């Protein structure tokens, strides 16, 4: 890569391309699923998330846990969006959707 005195896009633009970015996206989805795995089933366990203000949201619903996570990964946000979609259309299964999506990708 050469300096190219006048550049195409603004400096600081980050570009990731090819198989590695797809594998990284799959890994991010795996992390998102792992963030909610243990809340599934009659033996599930709750998660406690503290915001910046100091308020604590103890929850077992997967959609709530995903919403309280400040996810910024573009590929990981898809899992949060589908959790919200499952909550909106049905109301139950917000953990199963994320687990199944991450499992497909893995």
């Amino acid at each position: 890569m050469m300096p190219t005195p006048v550049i195409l896009l603004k400096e600081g633009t980050d570009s990731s391309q090819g198989i590695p970015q797809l594998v990284s996206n799959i890994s991010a989805c795996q992390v998102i699923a792992e963030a909610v795995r243990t809340t599934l089933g009659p033996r599930g366990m709750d998660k406690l998330i503290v915001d910046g203000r100091g308020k604590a949201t103890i929850s077992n619903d997967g959609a709530t846990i995903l919403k309280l996570l400040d996810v910024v990964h573009p590929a990981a946000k898809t899992l949060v969006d589908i959790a919200k979609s499952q909550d909106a259309e049905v109301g139950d299964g917000t953990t199963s959707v994320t687990l199944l999506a991450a499992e497909f990708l893995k």
Binding site: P3, T4, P5
Partner: protein
């Protein structure tokens, strides 16, 4: 901005007419400074060093050395003048003036779309013709005392004040004629130049011996 700039971002490049203009401007500035030096009617310059030493001079080579310049073309012309002074010992101001005028007259035609190669070919032809004419015009003579006195006058009058020049002419002519051996190269190392700092500047003279 160019080829070199991409590989080395902190590179300074002047290409084609930019480089030509840079070189010609440097030569013209040197010529403008040294114009006043030429001839016995020229003007003395006062040069002060960093330490505060004062050096009044009119020599072109000395002025070039003591000028505060950091230009590449100026460095090239200074090297040429230094070689001239080392070998012949005269003509440094003429060197700078002729170089500057050559570059200016060449640019007078180059700005009209003429390629510099044609100008250089014309320069070569003119130089060989000029050398032939100079060979034809020189005056072969017997270097008696009077001719040497005239040459010493022509140099020293351009270098110093008229009365000091008149004294130095006799001094230098007698000094050269004393150490000159027939049909042998003259060894200038055998003329010691010792300076004393107690009398007037017209009291300098020649001693038929050593100090």
């Amino acid at each position: 901005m160019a080829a070199v700039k991409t590989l080395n971002p902190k590179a300074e490049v002047a290409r084609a007419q930019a480089a030509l203009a840079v070189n010609i401007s440097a030569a013209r500035g040197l010529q403008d400074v040294l114009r006043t030096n030429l001839g016995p009617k020229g003007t003395m310059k006062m040069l002060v060093s960093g330490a505060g030493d004062i050096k009044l001079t009119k020599d072109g080579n000395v002025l070039l050395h003591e000028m505060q310049i950091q230009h590449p073309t100026a460095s090239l012309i200074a090297k040429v003048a230094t070689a001239q002074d080392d070998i012949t010992g005269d003509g440094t101001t003429s060197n700078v003036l002729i170089i500057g005028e050559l570059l200016k007259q060449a640019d007078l035609y180059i700005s009209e779309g003429l390629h510099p190669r044609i100008i250089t070919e014309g320069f070569e032809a003119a130089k060989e013709k000029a050398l032939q004419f100079l060979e034809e015009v020189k005056v072969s003579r017997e270097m008696d005392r009077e001719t040497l006195i005239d040459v010493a006058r022509t140099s020293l009058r351009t270098k110093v004040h008229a009365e000091l020049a008149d004294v130095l002419t006799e001094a230098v002519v007698d000094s050269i004629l004393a150490i000159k051996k027939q049909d042998e190269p003259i060894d200038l190392f055998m003329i010691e130049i010792m300076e004393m700092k107690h009398k007037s500047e017209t009291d300098t003279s020649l001693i038929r011996g050593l100090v």
